[PDB]
Amino acid sequence: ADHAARQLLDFSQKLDINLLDNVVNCLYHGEGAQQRMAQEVLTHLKEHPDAWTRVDTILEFSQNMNTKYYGLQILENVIKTRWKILPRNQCEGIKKYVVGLIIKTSSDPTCVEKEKVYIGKLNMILVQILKQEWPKHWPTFISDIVGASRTSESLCQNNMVILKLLSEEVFDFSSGQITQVKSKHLKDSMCNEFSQIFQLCQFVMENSQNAPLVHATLETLLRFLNWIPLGYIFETKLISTLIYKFLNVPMFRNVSLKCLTEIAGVSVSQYEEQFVTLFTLTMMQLKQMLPLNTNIRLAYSNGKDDEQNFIQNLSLFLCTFLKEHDQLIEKRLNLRETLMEALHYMLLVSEVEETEIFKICLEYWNHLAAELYRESPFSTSDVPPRRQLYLPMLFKVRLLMVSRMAKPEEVLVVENDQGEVVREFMKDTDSINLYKNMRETLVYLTHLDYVDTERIMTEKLHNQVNGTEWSWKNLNTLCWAIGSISGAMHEEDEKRFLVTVIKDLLGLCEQKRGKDNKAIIASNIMYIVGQYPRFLRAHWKFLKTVVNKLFEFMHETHDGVQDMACDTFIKIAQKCRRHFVQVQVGEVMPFIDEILNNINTIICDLQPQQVHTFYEAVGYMIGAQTDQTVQEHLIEKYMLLPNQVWDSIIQQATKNVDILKDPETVKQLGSILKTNVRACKAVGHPFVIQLGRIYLDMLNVYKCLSENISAAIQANGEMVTKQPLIRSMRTVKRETLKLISGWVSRSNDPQMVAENFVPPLLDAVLIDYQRNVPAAREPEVLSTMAIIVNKLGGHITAEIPQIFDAVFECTLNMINKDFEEYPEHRTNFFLLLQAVNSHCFPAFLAIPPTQFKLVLDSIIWAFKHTMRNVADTGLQILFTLLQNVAQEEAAAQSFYQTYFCDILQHIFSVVTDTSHTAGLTMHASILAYMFNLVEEGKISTSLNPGNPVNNQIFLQEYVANLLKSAFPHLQDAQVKLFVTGLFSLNQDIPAFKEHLRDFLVQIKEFAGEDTSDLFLEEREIALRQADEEKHKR
């Protein structure tokens, strides 16, 4: 029925309501291609100009409510876009029709109850008509709507909904949808007439007995509280009415508490007794509904959604009001009990097992702890006056923090594109933030009083050993709490506390039976030990015993024991790396020598990734050896087994290169390269011995594997990339690149690197990249070079032409057909281009002019992407290129004459596009820098070859013609105003960005020949003031 569906677009005969209803139902109740067909037909019908004329029929005949919504969508689009060009008679007709519909459907309870969506759409259409026409041509809207609100309660409810929608669209969601002048005009007009739409709310809240009406009035008051003058809040009886008439009513609790939270967030000095009475009255009204002896934990766990929302709103209110006016509450002596009860409520709500509520409570707890610490960071004795208030309840906060401690680490098993499962440690997630906040709060509290925290932890540990509270999660929480306060005690107090804790935990380890319980206890002991490196550094026998015990756990096949051992060992190696290389008292040799001598017996039972972790940990101990020859000997002995395997494989391959196709040897190569990458990361520059030992063999194997992969993909298609052998080869290539880039990132001799390690790459990696088929090329090659260019910088500027001849042409031809395929290549190519531009700009003076034109075209192609990262990189590259060219006044004039107009045209092409608004800030900078660069007369040569004319005039004419021809519906006056603003606000980036947003808003609507919304005078005065301020500077 495709022809039947598409018949709707004929616009030749009367609309067929049956067909429209059928297609709409198919859209909302379709299974497959029918749904897409209906969607496409409806979208095409919606975007047809002059289709709004049919709406008056859709709303009169169609019975389905989803088609009337569609007609309202069409009407709303027309009202938003082309209101100013419709004749006055049609505008009046639409206005009267919409108002009549609103009055008709809002006066019958049945329809309002049933639909609830058609009415909302009508209200939104009326709000759009108001924004278009309210104050200028509708002077008495507020008087009439408020006057009409006295005729019925249903009408009053709908009018309240309309008023809140208007308030939202004028004050809350105005930025980006209304020009600054028009938004300010609307705000002033609404603030002037608000004294009348506030008597209505007061009357309804004090005389109405209709629950939905009063609830709607409160819901709109909640929105009005965002912007109304404070006089309407604190100089009337609004707070008292909210506290006593609606807070206690179960069906008005949530909205009333939201209103009180909005009021409590106001920080002003003129009103401080009203905040004081906002607290005492609220608290007295709160302990009659939430008794202090209530177990909010259990009650919340099994409760209705309304009660849970109330608990969250109460936490928000208490947090906000305390954070704001704790000083005011504390100053009054007779309010001490109320403050203590508010803190008791905060403590009760902190027990609820909801993450969001706990975060809301924890931010206030952290605020209070930080304030008390900043008052005086010394332990309690006199005592600071403000700390004495909270002394009776600080141990409760300490107990709460110790009891609900969050997990420090977040480990996730993830498989990459090559099917290699690895453990990733999420770093900056929400859980890590929660743990960090809890740790900070507990550290502050421990600084305030360490004895109490030690007592709490000791009591909990005792409750664990006796078994009355034993549990795996409880012990884990206790040990995380113990480890979170590392460094918050003096050295001797910490030593005694650690001795006690570790002795008790060891005593409990033998007591508990079973392998799992012992494994948990040992894991907790090792976690605690690894979190106190100062204790380990102080005492050598204990550190050596701990390291030996960790080595013993590496032969444990129980799940999670070897991983724990490796994590603890790497932590201890990082923190205490200097106690292994040096000879200790009673030791004839350094411990690192002992570890290296018997290393095959330690990693025998480890899995490959655990072996990599162990090699990294040992590497962290070899970078701490300052002596050069000793460190060289350690590195040579530290890389003995991988070197043996690598030499075996290379010697075998020398006989015949066909072995490299064997999957087992490729797996061995990948593992060896991963080990080398980890060791390089751990050691740093001194790893040059190993790197130069294996460099050329690594490059040759890389080239062989790359050729094999390219041949396979060429002869079998891109499907082969998912085979195990191709995956292994790609893994080997990526590990080779990672090793090279990682070492270069940590070298300390750019000249030596450029002279030795770079030249081989050009023949081995770059020309190989060029020779590969597009589907077999490694994007990482483009990133590795970036990491090199960011490091060697001026030392690699002589080889940029070779790198470009190798990669630039092929990559650009690969990624210049669309904006979708090859995302990694796009990202890395533009990162490499950015690196070259930032660090090796003079290389652009050596490439031919044609290649520079290609580079600039690629930069322009960068910021036309819909991918945010690529577009951002392109904008950064363009800004940096302009700045670099500005410095060299010799070729700056030629560059300007050649590309200034083109760059300006493309920037304006992407600015006036709604798909690039995310980059607007950069657009504000670049454009400004350009226009300023012409207002200061930096472009000495005339940009117009036709005749010598002032640049500031030629540019104005050029931009005006550019914008007028692209958007012919714009008036000349507003285009000229926009160009003047461009040339005036060029030294105020936020104002420039607001100017751009205003223009984006303007280009969306057809103003015809109406100047009622342009406000040319006000904006011209604003631009003149901005220019004067710029001149004064």
């Binding site: 010697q651 040059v688 130069g692 050329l696 490059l699 040759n700 194997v701 062989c704 030596m752 030795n756």
Partner: peptide, 11 residues
């Protein structure tokens, strides 16, 4: 030599 010669050379 900072970079050792290649035992395995891939033509």
């Amino acid at each position: 030599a900072v970079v050792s010669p290649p035992k395995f050379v891939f033509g």
